[PDB]
Symmetry: C5
Subunit: 256 residues, 5 copies
């Protein structure tokens, strides 16, 4: 069971360095589709957070957390590239040696730049809608945009650790079943979990900092506070995806 | 995986005009339906919005985007012609040289009109019920059908982009999975995102203005404003479905 | 896929009038199961409607719609004869030369009369439950039954279309997928819409003007006001079932050949 | 599709008496399993009424119906034997001569009794939990078991009919599809329907009264109403399965 | 239908011990997974209940039970080794001779401890985030670690029994169907039922007593209250799985 999976994970890992070594335009795009897809999820639950944080309701983080299913679901279904999964994958394929430590940091790089490109594009467009001009919407943006850049390191690190856990554990669950519906539910869950709980996702945080910097209605974080939050959380994501899930998957299904 | 998708996409475009070119009756009826189905979605959400606006609920815009999955789900299940969705289909199709740059417009036209024919035929029939005869139902249709015409062209554009990114990706999602349940789910999300977040949909607004103009009890906008909108937004809906969605599927899946 | 679907729609007309001929007991029964099944869901959403009207809640009309799904789902899953439905199937199956205007009108009658007999039986049985002796629910029933009589024939007619447009469209959907999960899900949305929006449904209104006439804890409507509501609604229903759904499906799927 | 369905039922019943004609120990520990599964619902949906009635939220009777779904679900997904199911099963079958009045009743009382062991077994255990010592949960048990016992036979009898119409019909639906998912979705709506509407279920009452009795903190029921209710309701559920759903399904697909 | 399921249940328990009689490092890393997953569940539903108790919303208990779905479905979807599951499985196999009384009480320990390991890990990494710095989260994590620990043995014995009754029947449901969707749905139901009703699942508490025993902000009772709770609850899970379900599932499938 775990072999057929660490098998699936290994092949897919390969099929990633192969497309990269084909066209960079291709790999670049698909990374900058996942970023934009995932970013869509921030817009929903932030248009949310405002309306419910504003009216005092205690349901905000709950309703928000639930309504972030559209994120990793657009990704997995469209078959696009997102770094947070490239972690657990590109790892066990480096452990199961389908791709090397070479090919791993080769990936995690471009996908991360790709993933950012997507956020930035959705930013421009999203900001260009006047939606984040006035109101308690860009207010929820700004504050949490600021909330997260002022947060100490080990949190953003350790919060980041638990995030890419669920994210991978879902991505894995995708590999483990053939019912797309079932994938979407497991995802729906694993994101309801991390979001409401209150964890951190780099490719996500990007769309947040993608909007709150093009903003003609505030900064409260600058670029410096963004770099920090990412590299903090990026760093966190990796231990979670690679050294827990990426590794443990490699073990559980190693033809030993 | 992306290759295959592209092919399927390409046929759908080929198989589109092909039909339009055999019959214009059969195709008009289809867009006619589609635009009405999408407008059934509007009646529902607006009968909600007035009922929740009247009671000042902090949720109203969250319950609405939840209650819109019916619109596009009815399209994809009855297998009918939706102008926005085509934007991806024909653009990726025309691109993949399966169909022409003149087969492309001849679809967009013939559907953007069909949908509206439906929007109309449905708009009339709604009025003849008279939930619009007065009260917060009739009201909501108004106060909102006004707000759209009196809005920057810079807004209606990017609003109308991000919407029809979520609309085609929902469609793209139906072109990649064989679960009719998962097809519906993703459609249910994508409209949760685009409607709750305040994006704009040409074929939907058609029913809005199909009803704020047939309703004896008042306008506040009149044709020009309705035209200033469908136009400012349909263009956006093309720029989203074509330049973003269709070009990317194309890039992500052509043999280099 | 529109041709293969008409084929199905057509093929479905055929073995229906074939069954009515085969025997009238077998057919009328099913018809009643349908009425009952649909009416069942009326008892649910009104109880909800009473529970929640009584507390002046805003989300009443909304929960009432989100809940009615069971009505048309039982129909489809049990595979049973529901008037509003045959409005689309039988028509487009005629147009597609499946059977005659004879069998069409002959089917529309029995279904409508069997749907009625389920509505009948359910009502008495339900009055027997004593769950409409007094309280906010027998109220909601009468409150609601009256409106549906005390309403202009023009709007009862029209509302009654869209409703059958939505019922039939969900039927149409039951024919274009092999996912019983998908069937129900689309029935869900379609009813959520038709109900919460404000549309009217002969077979389900059949179950409303059955409770409030059989309950001795009030007529505020009596038989006439029903005859009125039914008629206006049964027409509209027909005008959406056979004329928008029936026609369209045919025009989409008839081989010009 | 009717004749297949009928036949399925008919064979289903055969297997039943055959199992009963094989092992008594095997049949009566399946029975108890159902009743126990069923009773679990009653715990949850009274734990719900508890909280919900205690804060007078109008939605008490609504959330109960939505939550009682696990009952027949656990039974139907686990091939366990539920008395109320065999009312339609045993009868549809014996009407096709797949069995005899005798098997039917043997079943009907056997199944009924194991079922009664379930509720007996649960309640005891459930009493031992602390959850009925005090708190608004127990008031809800007492007050309910009470009314359930102190209500005109006529009534209870009719509430029986309606209930088992839904119970069996849902079971009917299980026999008519293969999407195990759907079997559930329907079970869901049928129980949402039957609880929230007011109808009485026999098996499920067992647990109710069982809990109330073996609760040291006040009964208001005594075994006095127990028998009364368990009879009046059961007598209804028999006309529910047998005379409606049972004989009705036979008349629907017999080679006549 | 029950034979396939006992045969399906036995092959299982052979592998579980045949995994340990092959590798410890294999088997435990999966059990540290199961535990963590279940924990992540507790990290969510307590995150809620902290917010929802901080505003007396009567709906606290219920919402929490609906959102707990993730733990056992994660454990299921990822094949990992969960203790409570085993209870029924083993004994169902040690009763139909595929493993021994040894292989049974052998499985039950390593996993029990494997599970505990992972629960301790997430714990620190959860404080590592500092979401138990203060707020009602750590508060709720405090009252409920202690309320559970300053509770009679017998109650928690009876409580825990009922739980693993459901937890195993949902696992048993896994075995009896090829729809992951359906599997996950039954877990969602079986979990919502055990938590909102009140019952006590040991491997979860492991995370609670892990979260709190590292929460810098307080112990409220200590280690002799954590051990007692775990002992009181674990043994209750075992009668419930081993004796109720296991013995039972066995009786149902056994071949005379």
């Amino acid at each position: 069971a775990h072999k057929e999976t660490l098998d699936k994970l290994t092949n897919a890992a390969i099929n990633k360095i192969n497309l990269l070594n084909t066209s960079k335009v291709k790999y670049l795009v698909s990374s900058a589709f996942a970023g934009l897809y995932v970013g869509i999820g921030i817009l929903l639950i932030f248009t949310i957070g405002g309306l419910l944080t504003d009216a005092g309701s205690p349901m905000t983080k709950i309703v928000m957390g639930l309504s972030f299913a559209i994120a990793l679901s657009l990704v997995i279904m469209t078959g696009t590239e997102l770094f947070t999964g490239n972690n657990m994958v590109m790892s066990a394929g480096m452990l199961n040696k389908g791709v090397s430590i070479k090919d791993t940091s080769k990936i995690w790089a471009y996908s991360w730049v790709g993933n950012l490109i997507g956020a930035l594009v959705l930013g421009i467009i999203f900001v260009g809608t006047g939606l984040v001009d006035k109101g308690p919407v860009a207010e929820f943006f700004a504050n949490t945009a600021a909330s997260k850049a002022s947060m100490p390191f080990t949190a953003l690190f350790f919060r980041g650790i638990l995030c890419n856990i669920l994210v991978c554990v879902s991505v894995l669950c995708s590999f483990r079943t053939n019912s797309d519906t079932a994938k979407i539910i497991m995802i729906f869950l694993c994101l309801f979990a991390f979001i409401t709980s209150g964890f951190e996702h780099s490719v996500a945080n990007m769309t947040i900092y993608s909007v709150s910097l093009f903003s003609p209605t505030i900064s409260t974080v600058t670029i410096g506070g963004a770099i920090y939050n990412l590299v903090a959380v990026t760093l966190g994501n990796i231990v979670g995806g690679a050294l827990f899930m990426g590794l443990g998957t490699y073990i559980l299904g190693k033809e030993k």
